[model samples]
Target: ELLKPRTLADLIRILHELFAGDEVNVEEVQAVLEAYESNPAEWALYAKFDQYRYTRNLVDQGNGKFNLMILCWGEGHGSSIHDHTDSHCFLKLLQGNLKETLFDWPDKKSNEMIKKSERTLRENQCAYINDSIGLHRVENVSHTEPAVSLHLYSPPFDTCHAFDQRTGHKNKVTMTFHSKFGIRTP
Candidate 1:
């Protein structure tokens, strides 16, 4: 039988089972994420947004193997150009539109990142990335609408590097969650 998860809780349950094995199957995870339809109502409880920046709300910490998060982006807000800290990062657009710009690894001597390609992800669209694929900056280009995306990171990371587009300088940043398991945190 095909797996169909209609609620956020169901999705979390299935994901836990998928990651329970010794090795995580990338295709299986991707298929599950791709099949899930965007349902804002199901995630409404954790869809909190911040006017100044995007908010990351933790949904499920996948048994120390991965973490699922709901990222709420306010209108005109976007993320800094960053790397995934060597983890497999998958994003599924839950609402609104998001523009993802990929960049090549920074030049060794100059520390300059070369422009790669860019694409916009509509609702229900999914994208996958890792350090090997390169760095990226995700933004909500709409001026009137906010964007929400579901992110799953394997072997959850606590820190990553943010790069300066012009100078190519990189700085390490600590990641934090705006909410955990449906509850807002200070």
Candidate 2:
């Protein structure tokens, strides 16, 4: 089958306009991502896989307004439960299926979290979460396939808090890119 093709540059241009506003919020960002599903081909550049670990590749640094990343999840791969400190986040699942579980942290000093809800995201589906919202986890559910998603964070962020559910311990962590495009950065 011949799928319609849309370049990453094209999507970046559209996002530049949407994220340029001083007042852009999570809901608006969510809607924009969902709107693009009409042309799912636009996200083709980011559709990638890595069997060793979940990989995050930088797509656009957004000229200081925001940052875009393509996250690839191998089967059974996932992120540690975490919170995006102060950034507003938006994600659009581009390929395969994944499960997201959101949590409520009772206090900053406590490691325990109250399970709030869970949702599954399939291809072309978008979701948003902000630093002020909740703690969450995302994982690729397939046993053998990989999953990919486009992630956007406004005003960009450098730090996040990760939680250890078993020990009720949490630590602040810095974010970094796993690669540029499909090229791994050593």
Candidate 3:
């Protein structure tokens, strides 16, 4: 994938061009991510940076702030739930095929309490998120092959909410979170 719109300005313009109707927003984000999936950092020397998986730099955020992250991933890698505090986002695929999962948060009152997640995305596919309500998780559902995608955050964000699937406990991550989590994003 050739890196078109190489500068931040270009990327922002591309974001606007792609942000069509609310219904198509997610798909558009995915399309752009896939478009530049291969050319990340302009030939590998640029180095990669991301707020969550790689590194996180935050903003004094509120309701709708966001950040832009470009990810290049390979086989056997994927991402977990990001600052699920409250975010609405989308991803564009650049190379290979990956799986993205969306989860539904549940109230603690019910036995039906479960982190309902979905398997999404294929080669050159995109996924949309509406996190205003709660949180969701994404993953690379591939045994073979790898994937790359671009992410966009609204109003630019700095912190996130992470979940412990085993204990079903939620944690509020105020600063950037790091991990050996060699995810497509991290």
Candidate 4:
């Protein structure tokens, strides 16, 4: 049987609980991770349901706040090499291989994609991203299969400045939706 997330509502409830408190309990987060690992199929579909590229879901949850959202990416798809401006991001790999290319600002115009720094992440792996230290590009490299991942940010992921692959222009606009989750991208 295909697995489904406990529920999108449940996932949002978890996020609400995370921000409702003054501080986060590492153990609690670990529990969530463990629960996710114990049942991979459910998460696989949850991640599959929440994905996109250029478009951001602008939300105002109140108090100048809103959880960015849960984002998913399918196989052979990924976000452009970019950095978040004054934001913290988190990711949980649900299924398949996720390769992230870490980089530092080569200049104001682009981030240097470090071939040597490239790393392949697998199922249930989680990552934290902060403005001071988070700079990278992610891709799903499966040629005949599919990859899925989940990402959450604070205040909603509204705007992004992506780089031009050819000239490294920091303002290039890329495709919005990751080709359908079931369909492989080139």
Worst 10 residues of 1 by lDDT: 106-115
RMSD of 2: 4.3
- Output the worst ten-in-a-row residue range by lDDT, candidate 2: 1-10
Better of 1 and 2 by lDDT: 1
Q: What is candidate 1's lDDT per residue for 1-186, written digit by digit as tens?
A: 338777778888889988887677777787788788877789998899998999999988789889999999999889989999989899999999999999987875656666799999999887999999999999999999999999999989979999998867889999999999889897
Measured on C-alpha atoms, candidate 1 has an lDDT of 0.89
Candidate 3, residue 61: lDDT = 24
30-107: candidate 3 lDDT, tens digit per residue: 556545434544423212344233332221122233455545454555555544445566665545665655555644
For each candidate in turn, the TM-score is 0.95, 0.85, 0.59, 0.64
For residue 146, model 2's alpha carbon misses the true position, in angstroms, by 0.9
Which residue pairs clash within candidate 4? 50-72, 68-156
Candidate lDDT scores, in order, read: 0.89, 0.76, 0.50, 0.53
Candidate 4: C-alpha RMSD to true structure equals 7.0
What is the C-alpha local distance difference test score of candidate 3?
A: 0.50
Pairs with backbone N, CA or C atoms under 3 Å apart (clashes), candidate 2: none
Best by TM-score: 1
Candidate 1 residues lying further than 4 Å off, grouped into runs, are none
lDDT-based ranking = 1, 2, 4, 3
- lDDT value for model 2: 0.76
